[PDB]
Design a protein around this nucleic acid. Structure first.
Ligand SMILES: [Mg+2]
Ligand SMILES: [Mg+2]
Ligand SMILES: [Mg+2]
Ligand SMILES: [Mg+2]
Ligand SMILES: [Mg+2]
Ligand SMILES: [Mg+2]
Ligand SMILES: [Mg+2]
Ligand SMILES: [Mg+2]
Ligand SMILES: [Mg+2]
Ligand SMILES: [Mg+2]
Ligand SMILES: [Mg+2]
Ligand SMILES: [Mg+2]
Ligand SMILES: [Mg+2]
Ligand SMILES: [Mg+2]
Ligand SMILES: [Mg+2]
Ligand SMILES: [Mg+2]
Ligand SMILES: [Mg+2]
Ligand SMILES: [Mg+2]
Ligand SMILES: [Mg+2]
Ligand SMILES: [Mg+2]
Ligand SMILES: [Mg+2]
Ligand SMILES: [Mg+2]
Ligand SMILES: [Mg+2]
Ligand SMILES: [Mg+2]
Ligand SMILES: [Mg+2]
Ligand SMILES: [Mg+2]
Ligand SMILES: [Mg+2]
Ligand SMILES: [Mg+2]
Ligand SMILES: [Mg+2]
Ligand SMILES: [Mg+2]
Ligand SMILES: [Mg+2]
Ligand SMILES: [Mg+2]
Ligand SMILES: [Mg+2]
Ligand SMILES: [Mg+2]
Ligand SMILES: [Mg+2]
Ligand SMILES: [Mg+2]
Ligand SMILES: [Mg+2]
Ligand SMILES: [Mg+2]
Ligand SMILES: [Mg+2]
Ligand SMILES: [Mg+2]
Ligand SMILES: [Mg+2]
Ligand SMILES: [Mg+2]
Ligand SMILES: [Mg+2]
Ligand SMILES: [Mg+2]
Ligand SMILES: [Mg+2]
Ligand SMILES: [Mg+2]
Ligand SMILES: [Zn+2]
Lengths: 53, 137, 97
RNA sequence: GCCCGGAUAGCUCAGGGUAGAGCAGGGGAUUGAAAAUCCCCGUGUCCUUGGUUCGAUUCCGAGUCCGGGCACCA
RNA sequence: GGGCCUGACUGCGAGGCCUGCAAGCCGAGCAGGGGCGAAAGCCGGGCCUAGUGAACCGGUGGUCCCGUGUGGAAGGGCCAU
RNA sequence: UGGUGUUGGCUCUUGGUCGCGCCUGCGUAGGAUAGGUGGGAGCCUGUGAACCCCCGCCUCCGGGUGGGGGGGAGGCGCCGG
RNA sequence: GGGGGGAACCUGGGGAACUGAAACAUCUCAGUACCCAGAGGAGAGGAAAGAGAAAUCGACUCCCUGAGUAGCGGCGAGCGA
């Protein structure tokens, strides 16, 4: 982690619940992460979005 | 102001608030011009003028109204005001309060979702050339 | 300062508590006491001067009970006070409490 | 953490209809020189993007960065 | 070097390495929902061994567990960070 | 050292902010001193119009406004460049 | 009528530190020691503007229990209805 390599949550786009925490280099990668991740609330894959920690 | 108007002024009194019905009974007493005056209903939305999203705009199909049928379009001006024709000075009193009330309803139906204040900060009923009366919406 | 002559109020002992930190209510870690120590809190005594049976009487009474002095004088009306020293008048007045 | 803020040309800067000002640079006048003075000239998505308006550095939303402010730190 | 991709999974975990404690470590297999592959299969980040910090206090998103006569509310618990 | 108690009277000058009354709002095209939109073909006149006489006056210098002395039937908009 | 005395005990007004926290400041020691005032053979408290969930109880005091519970706590040492 650094001011540039940052921590961040991944929120489920369908239930708005954060299910994952991970990191990114925000220079390297200014855009908000989208990724499919299993949301356990919905019990199926869902595209998760980067949300500020 | 002209004698004709100065006259009407007496049948009013600012302080008093009045009621949709009380105002409907005055309208006739306030329409002293040589023609079927209108009536109008001036509000004063308590929302932010310079903006959007929280812009009050739409239509209402008044049960009686106009007589000039219904569906009047109203849109809040740059200030916080919104104005609209509710009928002509003729119309039996028990016919205007039905529209005044039917119009004011639409306004509330078009209030935003992000508005601070009591929305209907103030409301008034009038006639083309007559004075005006506040009212308890 | 010392003892209200009408109410009896006197200096009490209070702690003077020193804190630091952001209250929990404001989303802080909570408050810490950086020091506590004794102090006295005084009644707000003042002089009330008052003329009863022409003689001059003078009370040390807490501000809260300044009006109460004058009430004593009203109730002093039907009293056989004339010709007295101030010392015994005060005594006389104080006796209606 | 939250609140107030500046970004306008090389440097510094004031500003719902617009884009300029000081000296830096260059050309010319002048001088024995260095200047000072004097005349012209440049040097712009007015931080970014999105939205009002007929349109805007000007209003607003959103961003990015430095400037400031207050507080807190198990 | 390329193509597709998000398993840098959610629920667990047989059995071990290490070891005073507390930690640290490796992990087959089953379920859910996926990826890649014709398939066998592989995939619970990164060839590997460093890149870290117990608790307490508190923050923020869920959950809807407790709510001081009762219904709410305050405040707390629980999961995640 | 602020606030407040003990702590009062008169006055001058004052702002904030609440209600109502009214006036001020001039980039250019233009009858020329356009606040935002809406409403609205009549309104202003024996509750005195056309200019005129003292003017609160603001001014972007043309004018905007406002009470009255004089004053005895016409000014201002739809129209439309 | 008071004044002054009385071993302990009682109430009221004031009120430490060593020490413990294996340093220390909040915390503890402890409202203890001690000083002061008053009482009396006791003193204090006492006949609900109480308890608190029993649709209940019924002044106060003292013992046993409830209970090292409920809670309080640099959530530490500890304190403790
Ligand atoms: Mg993770
Ligand atoms: Mg990464
Ligand atoms: Mg779950
Ligand atoms: Mg204090
Ligand atoms: Mg504390
Ligand atoms: Mg008082
Ligand atoms: Mg490869
Ligand atoms: Mg997954
Ligand atoms: Mg095992
Ligand atoms: Mg072990
Ligand atoms: Mg599987
Ligand atoms: Mg598979
Ligand atoms: Mg396949
Ligand atoms: Mg298979
Ligand atoms: Mg596996
Ligand atoms: Mg601790
Ligand atoms: Mg916590
Ligand atoms: Mg919660
Ligand atoms: Mg309750
Ligand atoms: Mg519940
Ligand atoms: Mg419940
Ligand atoms: Mg309660
Ligand atoms: Mg209820
Ligand atoms: Mg809650
Ligand atoms: Mg002081
Ligand atoms: Mg104060
Ligand atoms: Mg004072
Ligand atoms: Mg004695
Ligand atoms: Mg004695
Ligand atoms: Mg005591
Ligand atoms: Mg004592
Ligand atoms: Mg001392
Ligand atoms: Mg100590
Ligand atoms: Mg010590
Ligand atoms: Mg110690
Ligand atoms: Mg020690
Ligand atoms: Mg020491
Ligand atoms: Mg203690
Ligand atoms: Mg006995
Ligand atoms: Mg007794
Ligand atoms: Mg007693
Ligand atoms: Mg009783
Ligand atoms: Mg604890
Ligand atoms: Mg304790
Ligand atoms: Mg204690
Ligand atoms: Mg006990
Ligand atoms: Zn979901």
């Amino acid at each position: 982690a650094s001011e540039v390599r940052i921590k961040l949550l991944l929120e489920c786009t369908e239930c708005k619940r954060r299910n994952y925490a991970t990191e990114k280099n925000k220079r390297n990668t200014p855009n908000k992460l989208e990724l499919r991740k299993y949301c356990p609330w919905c019990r199926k894959h869902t595209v998760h979005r980067e949300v500020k920690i | 102001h002209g004698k004709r108007y100065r006259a009407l002024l007496e049948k009013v009194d600012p302080n008093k608030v009045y009621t949709i019905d009380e105002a409907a009974r005055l309208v006739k007493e306030l329409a002293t011009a040589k023609f079927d005056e209108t009536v109008e209903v001036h509000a004063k939305l308590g929302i932010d003028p310079r903006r959007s999203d929280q812009n009050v705009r739409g239509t209402v199909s008044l049960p009686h109204g106009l007589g000039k049928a219904g569906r009047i379009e109203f849109r809040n001006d740059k200030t916080g005001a919104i104005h609209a024709p509710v009928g002509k000075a003729s119309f039996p009193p028990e016919k205007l309060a039905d529209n005044i009330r039917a119009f004011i309803r639409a306004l509330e139906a078009h209030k935003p979702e992000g508005a601070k204040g009591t929305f209907l900060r103030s409301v008034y009923v009038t006639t083309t050339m007559g004075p005006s009366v506040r009212i308890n919406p | 300062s010392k003892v209200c002559e009408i109410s009896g109020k006197r200096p009490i002992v209070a702690n003077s508590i020193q804190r630091r930190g952001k209250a929990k209510r404001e989303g802080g870690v909570g408050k810490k006491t950086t020091g506590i120590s004794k102090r006295r809190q005084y009644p707000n005594l003042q002089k009330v001067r008052v003329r009863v049976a022409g003689q001059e009487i003078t009370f040390r009474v807490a501000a809260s009970h300044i009006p109460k002095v004058y009430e004593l004088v009203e109730r002093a009306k039907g009293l056989k006070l004339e010709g007295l020293s101030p010392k015994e008048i005060k005594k006389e007045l104080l006796k209606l409490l």
